UniProtKB/Swiss-Prot annotation:
Whole-protein residues included: 1 to 136 of 950
Assembly notes: Interacts (via FFAT motif) with VAPA and VAPB. Interacts with the GTP-bound form of RAB7A. Interacts with OAS1B. Interacts (via FFAT motif) with MOSPD2 (via MSP domain).
Expressing tissues: Ubiquitous.
Localization per record: Late endosome
ANK repeats: 44-73, 77-106
Free-text comment on this protein's domains from its UniProt entry: The FFAT motif is required for interaction with MOSPD2.
Function: Binds phospholipids; exhibits strong binding to phosphatidic acid and weak binding to phosphatidylinositol 3-phosphate. Stabilizes GTP-bound RAB7A on late endosomes/lysosomes and alters functional properties of late endocytic compartments via its interaction with RAB7A. Binds 25-hydroxycholesterol and cholesterol.
Protein name: Oxysterol-binding protein-related protein 1
Signal peptide bounds: none
Gene: Osbpl1a
Length: 133
C-alpha cells in the first residue's frame, strides 16, 4: 500500500493545496518522509501529476514537474497527464506539459491520443501541430 506521505501527496495534489505539496516535496528532499513523487493511487494508477493536471492546480503541476515528476506516467486507462489536461481543456497546462517533454503521441488503452480525446478547439489545433513535428 502507499506510504502515509504518498497518501498526503495524492490528497493535496487532487485538491490543489499547493503549500502542502511543496512542504511534502521539501520533506522528501530532506528524506524526512518516504514517498515516491510518481506514486500512484490504489483502490487507479493516478499520479499526483495526473490529479493536479485533471483538476487544474497549476502551481502544483509546476512544482511537481520542477521536482522531477515523470511526465508520461500512465494511469490505469493508459492516459498520460497530457491526456488528462487535454481532455479537460486546460490550455496553459497543455503548454507547460509539452515544455517538460510530454509525449503527445501516446495512445491510451482506448486507442486515443490526447488530441483525439479533447473537445477544445484551441488545444486540438495545438496538438494537431505538435503531431506534425
Amino acid at each position: 500500500m502507499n506510504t502515509e506521505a504518498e497518501q498526503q501527496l495524492l490528497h493535496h495534489a487532487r485538491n490543489g493545496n499547493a503549500e502542502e505539496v511543496r512542504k511534502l516535496l521539501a520533506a522528501m528532499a530532506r528524506m524526512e518522509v518516504v514517498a515516491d513523487i510518481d506514486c500512484k493511487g490504489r483502490s487507479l494508477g493516478w499520479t499526483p501529476l495526473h490529479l493536479a493536471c485533471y483538476f487544474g492546480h497549476k502551481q502544483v503541476v509546476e512544482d511537481l514537474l520542477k521536482a522531477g515528476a515523470k511526465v508520461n506516467m500512465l494511469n490505469d486507462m493508459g492516459d498520460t497527464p497530457l491526456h488528462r489536461a487535454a481532455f479537460t481543456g486546460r490550455k496553459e497546462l497543455v503548454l507547460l506539459l509539452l515544455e517538460y517533454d510530454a509525449d503527445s503521441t501516446v495512445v491510451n488503452g482506448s486507442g486515443q491520443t490526447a488530441k483525439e480525446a479533447t473537445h477544445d478547439k484551441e488545444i486540438r489545433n495545438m496538438l494537431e501541430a505538435v503531431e506534425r513535428t
